[PDB]
Amino acid sequence: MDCRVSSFKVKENFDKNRYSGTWYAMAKKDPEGLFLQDNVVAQFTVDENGQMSATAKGRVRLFNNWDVCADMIGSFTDTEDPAKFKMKYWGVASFLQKGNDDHWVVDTDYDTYALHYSCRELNEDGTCADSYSFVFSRDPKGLPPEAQKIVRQRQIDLCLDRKYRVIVHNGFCS
Numbered sequence: 348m349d350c351r352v353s354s355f356k357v358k359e360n361f362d363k364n365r366y367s368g369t370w371y372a373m374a375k376k377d378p379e380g381l382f383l384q385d386n387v388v389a390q391f392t393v394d395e396n397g398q399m400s401a402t403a404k405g406r407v408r409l410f411n412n413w414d415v416c417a418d419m420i421g422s423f424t425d426t427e428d429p430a431k432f433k434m435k436y437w438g439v440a441s442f443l444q445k446g447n448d449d450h451w452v453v454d455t456d457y458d459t460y461a462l463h464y465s466c467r468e469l470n471e472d473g474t475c476a477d478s479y480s481f482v483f484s485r486d487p488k489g490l491p492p493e494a495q496k497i498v499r500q501r502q503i504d505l506c507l508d509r510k511y512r513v514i515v516h517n518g519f520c521s
């Protein structure tokens with residue numbers, strides 16, 4: 348049971364165009380502090396020069412109770428690893444958070460599911476101190492019993508097992 352971040356294995360030869368399109372977040376594992384809550388849908392596209400970007404809608408509560416529908420946007424720069432990106436994000440609205448997080452795709456089938464992960468804070472022993480993860484599906488209705496078994500194994504080998512929470516979509520942002 349090695350939970351060092353550098354130990355985690357990511358998607359072999361990640362194909363940036365097979366991955367583009369609409370993805371629906373079905374479950375998540377939260378990080379410390381302020382973060383997207385529900386009704387979150389992401390849209391990936393890749394330009395002619397291979398650059399990948401994405402926009403995202405989601406409900407987020409602020410200060411104290413203030414649900415707003417955050418329109419986020421991120422760009423991705425490539426690393427020595429096809430699956431491991433650096434993502435710069437920001438919102439159409441200014442008060443919304445800007446920032447830079449790693450963006451790694453641990454696993455995907457590009458036809459039905461994608462499993463994302465990001466460690467914002469590394470510990471002294473290499474394991475992650477503060478992290479979040481997303482489980483996306485191409486189908487707004489969710490994964491098959493059989494794709495769910497793959498997903499739950501991924502969560503365990505990430506040491507995030509039993510820490511995910513089902514995301515719901517009730518047109519709060521449509």
Ligand SMILES: CC1=C(/C=C/C(C)=C/C=C/C(C)=C/CO)C(C)(C)CCC1
Nearest residue numbers: 381382383389401403420421436443444
């Ligand atoms: C770029 C965007 C993503 C992440 C957004 C997050 C990090 C937003 C947080 C917003 C907050 C907390 C705003 C507070 O005012 C993910 C990874 C889903 C995939 C594609 C595009």
